[PDB]
Amino acid sequence: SNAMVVQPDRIRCGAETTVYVIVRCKLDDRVATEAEFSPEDSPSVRMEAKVENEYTISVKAPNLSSGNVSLKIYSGDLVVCETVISYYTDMEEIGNLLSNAANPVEFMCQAF
Amino acid sequence: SNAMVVQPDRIRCGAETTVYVIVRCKLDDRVATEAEFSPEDSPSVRMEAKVENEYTISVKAPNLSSGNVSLKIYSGDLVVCETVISYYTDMEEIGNLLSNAANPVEFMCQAFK
């Protein structure tokens, strides 16, 4: 799409995180740039976004609950990025890290 | 410096990860760009680095051991970025996340619920 990368696409709940969106089309530095975070079962949230450069937008992600959140970025009534970013809690990530670090396929003495 | 942001600056050991560097000065598109990862007790690893745009470089980070790694970005004999990135393991991050809880009763209630 037009959004090359949304770094990071995963956000930890409660942690102040800055999301960076690199764009392929040079952004118009004359229009207004804002972001919209839409959770699953919650009203949308309108965050002001900073234009770091002709291809880079930054936004301080809001403290939302766990689950998936849709991220839109309007560069002046024009959607320059439409993607989904996921929120997660500390316990969720600890459980995923244990499920990853406790895998007998990671041992594999011969791996065959 | 010339590196506005280097994201991510932390890399999980097993997970293949792409690092993005935003530069303050225009990049020459027609010049070969590479990266140099210097670990603490290991020889440096050189990687092909893609110039994504006039201000953005991307590089696939190599699978290194945990600790701090120095990242140098060369735009053809020209150092455009010099920063440090940290490698971490699964258990290290588990400990870091546990260190963020309020009190042990919280973690116990969340574990036994």
Please answer yes or no on whether B94 and A101 come within 8 Å at the CB atom.
Answer: yes
- Residues in A closer than 8 angstroms to B56, CB to CB, are 4, 22, 55-56
Q: Does A25 touch chain B (CB under 8 A)?
A: no
Distance from CA of B91 to the nearest CA of A (A): 8
Interatomic CA distance for residues A15 and A24, integer angstroms: 28
Query: CA–CA separation, B87 vs B19, rounded Å?
Result: 12
What distance in Å separates the CA atoms of residue A59 and residue B10, rounded to the nearest whole number? 20
Helix (H, G, I), strand (E, B) or coil at A15: coil
Q: Would you call B52 and A90 a contact, using CB atoms and an 8 Å cutoff?
A: no
User: How many angstroms from the chain centroid is the CA of residue B79?
Assistant: 17
Query: Which residue of A5, A20, A90 is in closest CB contact with B5?
Result: A20
> What is the separation, in whole angstroms, between the first and last Cα of chain B?
48
Contact A106 B14 (CB under 8 A): yes
Resolution to one decimal, Å: 3.0
Instruction: State the number of CA atoms in the 13 A half-sphere of A27 facing the CB.
Output: 30
CA B50 to CA B32: how far, in whole Å? 9
The position carrying tokens 């949304």 is A6
For domain B3-111, the question of CATH label 2.40.10.10 is answered with no
Q: How was this structure determined?
A: X-ray
What is the rounded distance in angstroms from the CA atom of residue B12 to the CA atom of residue B65? 9
User: Measured between alpha carbons, how far is A48 from A34 in angstroms, rounded to an integer?
Assistant: 5
Probe site for chain B from A2, A5, A107 (most B CB atoms < 10 A): A5
User: Which residues in chain A have their CB less than 8 angstroms from residue B58's CB?
Assistant: 5
CATH number of A3-107: 2.60.40.10
- As a whole number of angstroms, the distance between CA A33 and CA A30 comes to 9
Q: Using CB atoms within 10 A of its CB, is residue A3 exposed (0-12), middle (13-18) or buried (19+)? A: middle
Chain centroid to CA A71: 7
Question: How many pairs of residues across A and B have Cβ atoms under 8 Å apart?
Answer: 58
